[PDB]
mmCIF file of C-alpha atoms and ligand atoms in Angstrom:
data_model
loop_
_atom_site.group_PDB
_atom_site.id
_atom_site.type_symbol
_atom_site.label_atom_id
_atom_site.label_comp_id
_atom_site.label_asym_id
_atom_site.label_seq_id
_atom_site.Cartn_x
_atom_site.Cartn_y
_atom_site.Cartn_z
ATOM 1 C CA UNK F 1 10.987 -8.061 13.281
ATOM 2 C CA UNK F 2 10.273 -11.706 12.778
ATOM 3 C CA UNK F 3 8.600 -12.575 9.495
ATOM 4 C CA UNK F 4 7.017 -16.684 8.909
ATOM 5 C CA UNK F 5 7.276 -17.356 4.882
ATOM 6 C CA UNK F 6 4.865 -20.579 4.411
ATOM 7 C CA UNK F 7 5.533 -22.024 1.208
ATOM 8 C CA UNK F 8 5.339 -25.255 -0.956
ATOM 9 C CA UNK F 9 8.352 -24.439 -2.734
ATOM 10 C CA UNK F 10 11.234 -24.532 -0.356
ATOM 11 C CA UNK F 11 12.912 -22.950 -4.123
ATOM 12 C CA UNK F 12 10.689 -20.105 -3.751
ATOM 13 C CA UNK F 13 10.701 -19.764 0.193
ATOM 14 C CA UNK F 14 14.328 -19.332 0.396
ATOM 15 C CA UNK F 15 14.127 -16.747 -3.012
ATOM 16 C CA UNK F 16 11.778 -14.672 -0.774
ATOM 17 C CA UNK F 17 13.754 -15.187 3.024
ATOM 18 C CA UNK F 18 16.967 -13.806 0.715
ATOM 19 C CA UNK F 19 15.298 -11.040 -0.401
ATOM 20 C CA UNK F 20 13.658 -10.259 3.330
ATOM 21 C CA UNK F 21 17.197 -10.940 5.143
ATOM 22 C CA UNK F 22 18.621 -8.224 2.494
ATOM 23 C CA UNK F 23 16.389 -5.224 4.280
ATOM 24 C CA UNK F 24 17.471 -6.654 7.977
ATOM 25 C CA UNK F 25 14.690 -9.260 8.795
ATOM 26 C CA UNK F 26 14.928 -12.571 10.399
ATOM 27 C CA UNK F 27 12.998 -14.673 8.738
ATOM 28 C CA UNK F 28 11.659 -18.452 9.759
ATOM 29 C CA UNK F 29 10.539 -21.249 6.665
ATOM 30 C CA UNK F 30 7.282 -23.687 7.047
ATOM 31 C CA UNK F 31 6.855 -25.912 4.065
ATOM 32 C CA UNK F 32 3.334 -26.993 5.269
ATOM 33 C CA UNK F 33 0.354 -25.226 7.048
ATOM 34 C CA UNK F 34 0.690 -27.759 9.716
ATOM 35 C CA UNK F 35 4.448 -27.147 10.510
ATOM 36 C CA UNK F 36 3.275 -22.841 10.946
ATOM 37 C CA UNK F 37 0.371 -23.847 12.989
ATOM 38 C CA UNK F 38 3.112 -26.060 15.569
ATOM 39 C CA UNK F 39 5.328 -23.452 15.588
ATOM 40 C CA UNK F 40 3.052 -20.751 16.419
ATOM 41 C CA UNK F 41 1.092 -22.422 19.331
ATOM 42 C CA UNK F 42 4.040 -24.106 20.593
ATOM 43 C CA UNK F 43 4.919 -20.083 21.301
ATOM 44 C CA UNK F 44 6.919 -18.415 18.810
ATOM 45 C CA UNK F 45 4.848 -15.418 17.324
ATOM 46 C CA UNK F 46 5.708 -13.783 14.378
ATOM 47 C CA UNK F 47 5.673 -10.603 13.411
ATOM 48 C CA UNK F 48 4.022 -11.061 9.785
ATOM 49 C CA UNK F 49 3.099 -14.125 7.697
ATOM 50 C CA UNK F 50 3.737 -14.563 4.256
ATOM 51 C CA UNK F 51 1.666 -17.206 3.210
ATOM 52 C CA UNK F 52 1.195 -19.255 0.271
ATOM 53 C CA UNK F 53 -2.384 -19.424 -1.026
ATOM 54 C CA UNK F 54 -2.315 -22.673 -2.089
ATOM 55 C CA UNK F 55 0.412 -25.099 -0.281
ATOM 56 C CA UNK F 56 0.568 -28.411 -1.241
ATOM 57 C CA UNK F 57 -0.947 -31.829 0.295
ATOM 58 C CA UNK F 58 -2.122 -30.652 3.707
ATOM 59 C CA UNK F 59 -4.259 -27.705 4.789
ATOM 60 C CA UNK F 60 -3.979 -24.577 2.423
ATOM 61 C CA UNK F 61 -3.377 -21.006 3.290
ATOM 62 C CA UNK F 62 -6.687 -19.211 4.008
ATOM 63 C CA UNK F 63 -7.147 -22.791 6.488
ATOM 64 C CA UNK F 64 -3.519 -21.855 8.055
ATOM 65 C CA UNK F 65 -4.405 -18.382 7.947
ATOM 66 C CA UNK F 66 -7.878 -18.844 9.765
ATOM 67 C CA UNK F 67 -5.746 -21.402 12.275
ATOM 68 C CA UNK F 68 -3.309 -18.911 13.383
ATOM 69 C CA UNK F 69 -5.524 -15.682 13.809
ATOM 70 C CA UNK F 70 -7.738 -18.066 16.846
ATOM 71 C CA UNK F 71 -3.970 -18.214 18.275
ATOM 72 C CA UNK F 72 -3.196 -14.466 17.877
ATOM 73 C CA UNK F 73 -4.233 -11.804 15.706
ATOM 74 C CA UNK F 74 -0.925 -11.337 13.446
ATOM 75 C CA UNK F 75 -0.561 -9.970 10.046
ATOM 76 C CA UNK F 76 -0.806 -12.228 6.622
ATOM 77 C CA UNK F 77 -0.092 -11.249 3.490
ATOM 78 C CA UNK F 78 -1.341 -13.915 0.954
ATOM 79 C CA UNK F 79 1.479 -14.821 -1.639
ATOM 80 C CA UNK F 80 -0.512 -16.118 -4.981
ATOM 81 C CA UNK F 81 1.030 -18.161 -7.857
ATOM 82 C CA UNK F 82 -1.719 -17.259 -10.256
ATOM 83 C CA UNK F 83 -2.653 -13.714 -11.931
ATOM 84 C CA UNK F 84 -6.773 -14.649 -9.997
ATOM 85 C CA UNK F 85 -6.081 -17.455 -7.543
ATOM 86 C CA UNK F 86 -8.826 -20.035 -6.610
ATOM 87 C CA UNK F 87 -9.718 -18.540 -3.301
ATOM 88 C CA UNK F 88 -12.354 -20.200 -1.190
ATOM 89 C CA UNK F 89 -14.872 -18.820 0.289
ATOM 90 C CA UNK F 90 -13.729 -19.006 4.243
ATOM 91 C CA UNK F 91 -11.165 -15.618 2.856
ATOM 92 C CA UNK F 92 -14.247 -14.059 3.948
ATOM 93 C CA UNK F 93 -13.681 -15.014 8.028
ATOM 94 C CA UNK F 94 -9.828 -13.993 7.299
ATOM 95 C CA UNK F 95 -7.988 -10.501 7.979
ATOM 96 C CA UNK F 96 -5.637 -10.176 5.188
ATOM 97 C CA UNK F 97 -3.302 -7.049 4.614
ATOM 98 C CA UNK F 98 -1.981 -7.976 1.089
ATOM 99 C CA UNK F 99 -1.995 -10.190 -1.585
ATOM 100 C CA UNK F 100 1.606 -9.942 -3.756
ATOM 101 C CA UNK F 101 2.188 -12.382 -6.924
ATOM 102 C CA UNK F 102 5.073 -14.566 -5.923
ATOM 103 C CA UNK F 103 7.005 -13.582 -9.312
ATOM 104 C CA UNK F 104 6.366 -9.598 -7.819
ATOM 105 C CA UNK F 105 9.362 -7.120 -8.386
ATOM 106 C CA UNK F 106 11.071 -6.595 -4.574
ATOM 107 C CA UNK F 107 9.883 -3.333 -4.592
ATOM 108 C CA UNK F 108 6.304 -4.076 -4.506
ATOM 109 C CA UNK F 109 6.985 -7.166 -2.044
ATOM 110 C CA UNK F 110 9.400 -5.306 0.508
ATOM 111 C CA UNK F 111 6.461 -1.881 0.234
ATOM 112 C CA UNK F 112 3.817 -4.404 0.909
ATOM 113 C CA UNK F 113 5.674 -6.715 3.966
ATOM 114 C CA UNK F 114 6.712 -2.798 5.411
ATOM 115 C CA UNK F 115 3.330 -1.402 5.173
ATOM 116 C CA UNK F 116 1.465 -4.353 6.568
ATOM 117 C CA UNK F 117 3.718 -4.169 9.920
ATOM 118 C CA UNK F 118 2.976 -0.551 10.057
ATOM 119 C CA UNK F 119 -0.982 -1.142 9.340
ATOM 120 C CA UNK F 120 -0.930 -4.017 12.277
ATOM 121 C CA UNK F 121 0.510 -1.674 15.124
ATOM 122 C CA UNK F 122 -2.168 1.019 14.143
ATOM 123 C CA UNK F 123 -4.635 -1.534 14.611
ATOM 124 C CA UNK F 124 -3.421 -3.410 17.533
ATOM 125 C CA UNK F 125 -2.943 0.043 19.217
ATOM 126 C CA UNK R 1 -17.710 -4.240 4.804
ATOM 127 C CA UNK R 2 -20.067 -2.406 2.382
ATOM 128 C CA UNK R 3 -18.090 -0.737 -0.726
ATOM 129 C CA UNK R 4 -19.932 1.303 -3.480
ATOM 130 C CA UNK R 5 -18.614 1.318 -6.861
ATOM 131 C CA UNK R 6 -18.921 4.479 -8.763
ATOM 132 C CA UNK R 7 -18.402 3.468 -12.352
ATOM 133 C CA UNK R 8 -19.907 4.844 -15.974
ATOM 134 C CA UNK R 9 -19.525 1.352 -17.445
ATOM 135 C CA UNK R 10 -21.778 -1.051 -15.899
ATOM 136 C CA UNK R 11 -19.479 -3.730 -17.492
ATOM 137 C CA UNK R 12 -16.731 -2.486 -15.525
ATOM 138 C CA UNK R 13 -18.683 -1.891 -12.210
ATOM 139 C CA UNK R 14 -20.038 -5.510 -12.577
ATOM 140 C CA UNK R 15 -16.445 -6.841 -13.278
ATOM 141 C CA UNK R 16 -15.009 -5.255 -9.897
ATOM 142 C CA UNK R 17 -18.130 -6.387 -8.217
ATOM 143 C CA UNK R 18 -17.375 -10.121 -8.736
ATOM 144 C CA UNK R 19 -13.838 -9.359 -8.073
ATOM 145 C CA UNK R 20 -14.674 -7.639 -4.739
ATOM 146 C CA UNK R 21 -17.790 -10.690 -3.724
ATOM 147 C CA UNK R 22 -15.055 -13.467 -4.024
ATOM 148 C CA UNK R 23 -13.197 -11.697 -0.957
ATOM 149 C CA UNK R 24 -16.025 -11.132 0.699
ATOM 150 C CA UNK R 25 -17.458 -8.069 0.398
ATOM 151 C CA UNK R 26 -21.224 -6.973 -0.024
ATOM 152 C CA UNK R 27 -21.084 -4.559 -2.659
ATOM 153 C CA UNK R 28 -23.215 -1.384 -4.758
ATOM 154 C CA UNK R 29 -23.202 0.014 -7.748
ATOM 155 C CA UNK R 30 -23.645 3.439 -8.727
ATOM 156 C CA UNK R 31 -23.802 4.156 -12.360
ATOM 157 C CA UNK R 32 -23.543 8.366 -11.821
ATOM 158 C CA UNK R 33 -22.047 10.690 -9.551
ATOM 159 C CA UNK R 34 -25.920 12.061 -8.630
ATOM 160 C CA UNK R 35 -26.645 8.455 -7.791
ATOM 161 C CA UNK R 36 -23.472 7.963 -5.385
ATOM 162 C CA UNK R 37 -24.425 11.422 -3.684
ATOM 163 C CA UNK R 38 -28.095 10.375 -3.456
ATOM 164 C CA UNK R 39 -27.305 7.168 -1.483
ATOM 165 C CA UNK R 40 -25.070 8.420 0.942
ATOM 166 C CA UNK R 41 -27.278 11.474 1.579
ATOM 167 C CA UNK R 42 -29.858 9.212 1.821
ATOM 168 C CA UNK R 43 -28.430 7.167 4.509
ATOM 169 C CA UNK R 44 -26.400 4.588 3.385
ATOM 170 C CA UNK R 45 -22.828 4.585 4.064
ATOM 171 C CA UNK R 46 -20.244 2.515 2.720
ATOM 172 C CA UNK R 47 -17.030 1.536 4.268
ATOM 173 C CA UNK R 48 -14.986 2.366 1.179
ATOM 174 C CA UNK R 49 -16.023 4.260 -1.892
ATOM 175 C CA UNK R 50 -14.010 2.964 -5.494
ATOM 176 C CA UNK R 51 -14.407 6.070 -7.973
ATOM 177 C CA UNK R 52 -13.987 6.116 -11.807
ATOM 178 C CA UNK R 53 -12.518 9.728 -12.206
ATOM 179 C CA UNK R 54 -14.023 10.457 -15.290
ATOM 180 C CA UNK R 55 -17.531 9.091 -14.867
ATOM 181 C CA UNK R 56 -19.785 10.173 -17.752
ATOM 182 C CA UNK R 57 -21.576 13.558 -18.540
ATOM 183 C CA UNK R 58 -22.862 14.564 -14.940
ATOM 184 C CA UNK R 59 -20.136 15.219 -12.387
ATOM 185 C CA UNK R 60 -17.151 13.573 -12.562
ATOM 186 C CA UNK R 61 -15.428 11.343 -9.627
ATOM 187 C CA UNK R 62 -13.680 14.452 -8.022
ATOM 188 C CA UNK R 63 -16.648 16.118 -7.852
ATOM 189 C CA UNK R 64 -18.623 13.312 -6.194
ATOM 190 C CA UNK R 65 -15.756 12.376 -3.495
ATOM 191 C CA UNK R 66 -15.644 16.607 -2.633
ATOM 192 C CA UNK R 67 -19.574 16.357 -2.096
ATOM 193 C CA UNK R 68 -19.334 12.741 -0.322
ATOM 194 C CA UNK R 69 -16.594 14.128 1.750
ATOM 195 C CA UNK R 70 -19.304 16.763 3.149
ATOM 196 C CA UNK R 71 -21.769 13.989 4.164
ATOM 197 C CA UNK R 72 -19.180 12.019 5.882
ATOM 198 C CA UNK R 73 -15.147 10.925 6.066
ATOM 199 C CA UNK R 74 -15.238 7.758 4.014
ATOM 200 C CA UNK R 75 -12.004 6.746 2.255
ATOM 201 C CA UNK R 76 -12.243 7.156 -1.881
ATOM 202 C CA UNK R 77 -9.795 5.333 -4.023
ATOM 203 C CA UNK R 78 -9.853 6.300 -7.516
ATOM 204 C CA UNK R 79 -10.151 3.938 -10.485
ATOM 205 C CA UNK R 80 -8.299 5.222 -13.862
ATOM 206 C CA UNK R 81 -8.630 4.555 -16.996
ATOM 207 C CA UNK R 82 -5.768 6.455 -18.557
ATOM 208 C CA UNK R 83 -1.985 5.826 -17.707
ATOM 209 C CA UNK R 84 -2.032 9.720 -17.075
ATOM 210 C CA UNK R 85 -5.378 10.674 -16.006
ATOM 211 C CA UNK R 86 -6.725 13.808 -16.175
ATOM 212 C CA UNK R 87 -7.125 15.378 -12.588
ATOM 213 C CA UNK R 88 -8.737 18.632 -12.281
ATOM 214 C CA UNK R 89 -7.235 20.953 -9.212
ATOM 215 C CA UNK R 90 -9.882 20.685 -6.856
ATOM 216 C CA UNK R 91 -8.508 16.514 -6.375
ATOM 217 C CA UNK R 92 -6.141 19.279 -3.618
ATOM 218 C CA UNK R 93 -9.118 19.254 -1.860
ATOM 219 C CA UNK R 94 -10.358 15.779 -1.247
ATOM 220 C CA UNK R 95 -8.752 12.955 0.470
ATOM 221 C CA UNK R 96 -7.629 10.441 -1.533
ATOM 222 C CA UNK R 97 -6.338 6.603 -0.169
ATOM 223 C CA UNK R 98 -5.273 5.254 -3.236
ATOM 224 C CA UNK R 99 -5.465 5.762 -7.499
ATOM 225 C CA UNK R 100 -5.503 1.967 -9.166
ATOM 226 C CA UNK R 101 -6.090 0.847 -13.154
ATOM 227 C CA UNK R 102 -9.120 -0.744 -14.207
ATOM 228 C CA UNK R 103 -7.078 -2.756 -15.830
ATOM 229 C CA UNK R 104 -5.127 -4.042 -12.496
ATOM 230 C CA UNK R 105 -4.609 -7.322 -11.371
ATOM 231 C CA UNK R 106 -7.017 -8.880 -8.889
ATOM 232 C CA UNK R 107 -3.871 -9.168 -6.317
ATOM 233 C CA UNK R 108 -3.232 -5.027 -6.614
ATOM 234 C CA UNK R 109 -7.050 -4.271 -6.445
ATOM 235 C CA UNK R 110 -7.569 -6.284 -3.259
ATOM 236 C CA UNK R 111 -4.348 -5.012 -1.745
ATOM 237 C CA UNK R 112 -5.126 -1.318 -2.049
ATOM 238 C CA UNK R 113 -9.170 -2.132 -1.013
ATOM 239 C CA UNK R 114 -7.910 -4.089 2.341
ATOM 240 C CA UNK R 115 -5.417 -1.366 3.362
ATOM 241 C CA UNK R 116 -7.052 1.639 2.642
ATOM 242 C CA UNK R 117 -10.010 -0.268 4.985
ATOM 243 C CA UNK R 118 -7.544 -0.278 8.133
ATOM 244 C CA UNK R 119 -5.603 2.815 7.105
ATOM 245 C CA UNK R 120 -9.137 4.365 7.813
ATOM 246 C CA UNK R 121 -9.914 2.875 11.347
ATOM 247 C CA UNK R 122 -6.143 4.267 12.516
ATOM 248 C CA UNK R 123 -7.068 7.460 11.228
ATOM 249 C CA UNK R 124 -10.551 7.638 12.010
ATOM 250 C CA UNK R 125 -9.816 6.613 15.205
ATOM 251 C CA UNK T 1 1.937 18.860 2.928
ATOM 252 C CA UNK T 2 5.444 19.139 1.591
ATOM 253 C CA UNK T 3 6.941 16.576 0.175
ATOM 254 C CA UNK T 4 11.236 16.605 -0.314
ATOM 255 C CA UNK T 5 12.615 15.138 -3.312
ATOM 256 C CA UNK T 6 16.156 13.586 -2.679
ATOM 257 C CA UNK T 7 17.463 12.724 -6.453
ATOM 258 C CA UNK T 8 20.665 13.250 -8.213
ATOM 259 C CA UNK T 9 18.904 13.984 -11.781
ATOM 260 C CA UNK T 10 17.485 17.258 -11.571
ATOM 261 C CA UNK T 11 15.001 16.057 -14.825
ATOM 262 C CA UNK T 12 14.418 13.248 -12.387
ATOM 263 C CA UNK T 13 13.449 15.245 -9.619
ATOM 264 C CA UNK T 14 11.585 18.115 -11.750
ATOM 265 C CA UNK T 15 9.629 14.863 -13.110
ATOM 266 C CA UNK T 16 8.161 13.500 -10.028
ATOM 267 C CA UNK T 17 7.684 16.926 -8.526
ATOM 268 C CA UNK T 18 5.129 17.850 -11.750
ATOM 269 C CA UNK T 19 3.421 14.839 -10.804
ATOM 270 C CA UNK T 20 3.048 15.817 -7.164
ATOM 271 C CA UNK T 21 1.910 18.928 -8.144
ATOM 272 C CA UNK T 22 -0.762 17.287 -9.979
ATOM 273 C CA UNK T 23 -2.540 16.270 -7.113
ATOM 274 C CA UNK T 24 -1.996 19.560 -4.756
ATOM 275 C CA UNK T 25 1.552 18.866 -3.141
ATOM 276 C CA UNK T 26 4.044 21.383 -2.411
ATOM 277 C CA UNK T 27 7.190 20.119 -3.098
ATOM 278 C CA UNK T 28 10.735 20.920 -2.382
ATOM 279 C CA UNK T 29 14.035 19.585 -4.539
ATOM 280 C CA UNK T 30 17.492 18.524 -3.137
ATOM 281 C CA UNK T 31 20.104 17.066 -5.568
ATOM 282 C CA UNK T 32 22.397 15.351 -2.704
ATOM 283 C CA UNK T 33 22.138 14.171 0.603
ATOM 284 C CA UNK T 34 23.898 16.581 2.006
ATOM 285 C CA UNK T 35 21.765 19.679 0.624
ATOM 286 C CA UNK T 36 18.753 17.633 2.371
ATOM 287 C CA UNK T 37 20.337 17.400 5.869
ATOM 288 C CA UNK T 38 20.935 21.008 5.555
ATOM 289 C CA UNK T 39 18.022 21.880 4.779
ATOM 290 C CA UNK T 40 15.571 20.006 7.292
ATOM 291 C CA UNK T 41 18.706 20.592 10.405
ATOM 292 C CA UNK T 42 18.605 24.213 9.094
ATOM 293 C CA UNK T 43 14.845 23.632 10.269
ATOM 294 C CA UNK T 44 12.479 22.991 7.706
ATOM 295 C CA UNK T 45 10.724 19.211 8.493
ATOM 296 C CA UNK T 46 8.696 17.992 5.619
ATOM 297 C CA UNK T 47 6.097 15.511 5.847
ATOM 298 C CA UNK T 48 7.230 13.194 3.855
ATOM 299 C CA UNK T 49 10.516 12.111 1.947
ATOM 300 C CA UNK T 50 10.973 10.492 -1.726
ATOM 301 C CA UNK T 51 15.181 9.433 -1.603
ATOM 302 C CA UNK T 52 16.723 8.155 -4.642
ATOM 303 C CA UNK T 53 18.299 4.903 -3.232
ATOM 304 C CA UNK T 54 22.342 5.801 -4.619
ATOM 305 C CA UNK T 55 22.555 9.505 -5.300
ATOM 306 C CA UNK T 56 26.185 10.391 -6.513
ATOM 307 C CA UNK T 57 29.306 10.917 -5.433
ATOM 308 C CA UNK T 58 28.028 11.936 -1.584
ATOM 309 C CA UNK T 59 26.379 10.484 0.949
ATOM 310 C CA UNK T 60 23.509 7.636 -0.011
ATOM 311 C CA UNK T 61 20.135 7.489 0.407
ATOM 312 C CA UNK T 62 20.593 4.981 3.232
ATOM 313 C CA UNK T 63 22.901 7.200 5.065
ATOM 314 C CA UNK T 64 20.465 10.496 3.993
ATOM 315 C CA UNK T 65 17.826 8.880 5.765
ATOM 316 C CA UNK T 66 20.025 7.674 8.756
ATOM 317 C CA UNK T 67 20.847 11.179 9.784
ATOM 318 C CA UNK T 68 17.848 12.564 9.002
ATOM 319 C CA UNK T 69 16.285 10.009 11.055
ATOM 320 C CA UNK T 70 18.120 11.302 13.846
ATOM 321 C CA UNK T 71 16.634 14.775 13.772
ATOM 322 C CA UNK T 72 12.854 13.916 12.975
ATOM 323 C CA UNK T 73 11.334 10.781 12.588
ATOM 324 C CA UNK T 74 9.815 11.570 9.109
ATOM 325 C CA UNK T 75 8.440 8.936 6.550
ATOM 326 C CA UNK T 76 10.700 8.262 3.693
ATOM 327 C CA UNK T 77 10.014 6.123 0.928
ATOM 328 C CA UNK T 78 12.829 4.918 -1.347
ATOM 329 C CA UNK T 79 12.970 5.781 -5.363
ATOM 330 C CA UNK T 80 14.851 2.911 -6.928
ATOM 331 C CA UNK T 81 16.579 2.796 -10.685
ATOM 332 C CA UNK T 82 17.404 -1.329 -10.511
ATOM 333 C CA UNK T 83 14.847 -4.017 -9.987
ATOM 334 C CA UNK T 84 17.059 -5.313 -7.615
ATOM 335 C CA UNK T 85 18.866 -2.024 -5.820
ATOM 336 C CA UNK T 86 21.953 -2.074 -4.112
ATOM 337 C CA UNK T 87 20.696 -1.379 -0.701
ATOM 338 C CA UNK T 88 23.472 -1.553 1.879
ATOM 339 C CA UNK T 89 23.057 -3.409 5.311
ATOM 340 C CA UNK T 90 22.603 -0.058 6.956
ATOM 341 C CA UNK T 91 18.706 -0.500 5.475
ATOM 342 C CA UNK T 92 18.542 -2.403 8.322
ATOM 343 C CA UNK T 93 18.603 0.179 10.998
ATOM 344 C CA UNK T 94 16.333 3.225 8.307
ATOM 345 C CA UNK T 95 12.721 3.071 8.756
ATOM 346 C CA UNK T 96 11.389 2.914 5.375
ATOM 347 C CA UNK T 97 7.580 3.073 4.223
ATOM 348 C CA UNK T 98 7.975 2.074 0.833
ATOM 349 C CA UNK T 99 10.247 1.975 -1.944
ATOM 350 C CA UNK T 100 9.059 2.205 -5.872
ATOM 351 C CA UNK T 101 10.272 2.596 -8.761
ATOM 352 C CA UNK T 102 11.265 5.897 -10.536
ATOM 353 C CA UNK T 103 9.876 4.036 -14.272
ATOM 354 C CA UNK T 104 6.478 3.397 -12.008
ATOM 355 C CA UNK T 105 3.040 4.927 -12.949
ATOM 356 C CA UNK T 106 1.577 8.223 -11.526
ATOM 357 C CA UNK T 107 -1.096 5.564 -9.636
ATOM 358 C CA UNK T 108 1.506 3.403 -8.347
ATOM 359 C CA UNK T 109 3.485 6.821 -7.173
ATOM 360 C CA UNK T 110 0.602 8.952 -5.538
ATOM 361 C CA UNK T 111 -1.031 5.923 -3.971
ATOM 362 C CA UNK T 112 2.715 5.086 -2.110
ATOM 363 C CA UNK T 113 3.170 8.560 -1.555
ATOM 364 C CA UNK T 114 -1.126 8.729 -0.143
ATOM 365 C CA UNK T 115 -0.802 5.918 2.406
ATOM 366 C CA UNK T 116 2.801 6.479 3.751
ATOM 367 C CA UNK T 117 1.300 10.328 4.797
ATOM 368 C CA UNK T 118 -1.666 8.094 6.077
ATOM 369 C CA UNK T 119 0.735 5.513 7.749
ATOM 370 C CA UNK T 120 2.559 8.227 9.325
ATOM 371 C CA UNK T 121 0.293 10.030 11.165
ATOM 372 C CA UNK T 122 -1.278 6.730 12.392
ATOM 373 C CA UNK T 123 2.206 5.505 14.006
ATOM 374 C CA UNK T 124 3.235 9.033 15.188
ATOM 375 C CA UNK T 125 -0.132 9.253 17.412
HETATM 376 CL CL1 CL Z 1 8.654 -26.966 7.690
HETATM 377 CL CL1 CL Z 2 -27.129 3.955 -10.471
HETATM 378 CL CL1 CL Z 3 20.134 20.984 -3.941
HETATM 379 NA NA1 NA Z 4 -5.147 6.288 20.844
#
């Protein structure tokens, strides 16, 4: 299982990708909306997103997430900085499976990440 | 998505509301058990019921998800109040997808709404 | 639906068991890994499995679910003591559905223990 972590923070990428590579995923790191959006056209689909809410500069998540479900319908789980993010109103046009606060115990991420992969192959069935 | 809220306190009802409308959901409110089982019986069905377990001095939330459970297999996730609610021994007869605080963060509200959603079109199916 | 409890503390065990009961679970008890081998090889599948991540001086979780993975495929979700648990790299190769914490709430519990039965059934179709 391949999981994308899109994150601002390369700090708190690689905190989550250590945590992910701990229960036997492979995990790939964008640090901007852009960079997931190349690497998912340009072919390499991934089993699960986590994706940052906000980002930084460029496009922010729901945008990335709205992006990458015209190239495939995958699984995101929003990550979110902020006890009630600013979330805009295109979430509405987005399928989400989660949102998990970035400073969430491992338990509750790892639960979320495993029942989100499960939840997609019902679906996709 | 339609979700009815079954709630006691308006206040509350009104506070998940908003929550719920920011993700994009269309949303009712039904301030008594009688008034849940009325509107289903009547014709409306939601995609997801959320049910205060205690509701007020009518029936209480067990009560209306056994009766809405008659009318039609919609998935019920139980709001508490208590830490340690109490949960009379017919709750062995209805199918529950999920128990969550009123008091829970936006980001564990959301996740339990959005997977007990799909969890419902695998089984349903 | 029965439910096995894999813990090492018996008050442990008995604890989350009373809770189960609660909401209309049967549940059976084993206090190693061993005893639960034996008991579902001896022929006895239950629908679901709660294993305490370490256990004592026998097998581990990991390795409980390993083998017992190898006679049914049957959900098991983890019971952890640490925020961040010693999971071995074996995790890698268990299918897990969850893992929470045995200091979690009764909502946080059931709900885990609600959508893993749910999960289940929707992958084993
Ligand atoms: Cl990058
Ligand atoms: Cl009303
Ligand atoms: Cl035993
Ligand atoms: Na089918």
């Amino acid at each position: 299982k391949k999981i994308l972590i899109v994150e601002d923070s390369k700090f708190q990428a690689k905190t989550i990708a250590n945590i992910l590579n701990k229960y036997g995923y492979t995990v790939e790191i964008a640090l901007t909306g852009e960079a997931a959006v190349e690497k998912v056209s340009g072919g390499w689909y991934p089993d699960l997103i986590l994706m940052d809410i906000e980002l930084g500069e460029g496009m922010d998540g729901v945008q990335t997430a709205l992006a990458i479900q015209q190239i495939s319908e995958l699984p995101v789980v929003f990550l979110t900085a902020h006890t009630e993010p600013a979330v805009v109103e295109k979430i509405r046009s987005v399928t989400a499976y989660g949102y998990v606060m970035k400073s969430a115990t491992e338990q509750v991420l790892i639960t979320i990440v495993e029942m989100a992969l499960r939840l997609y192959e019902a679906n996709v069935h």
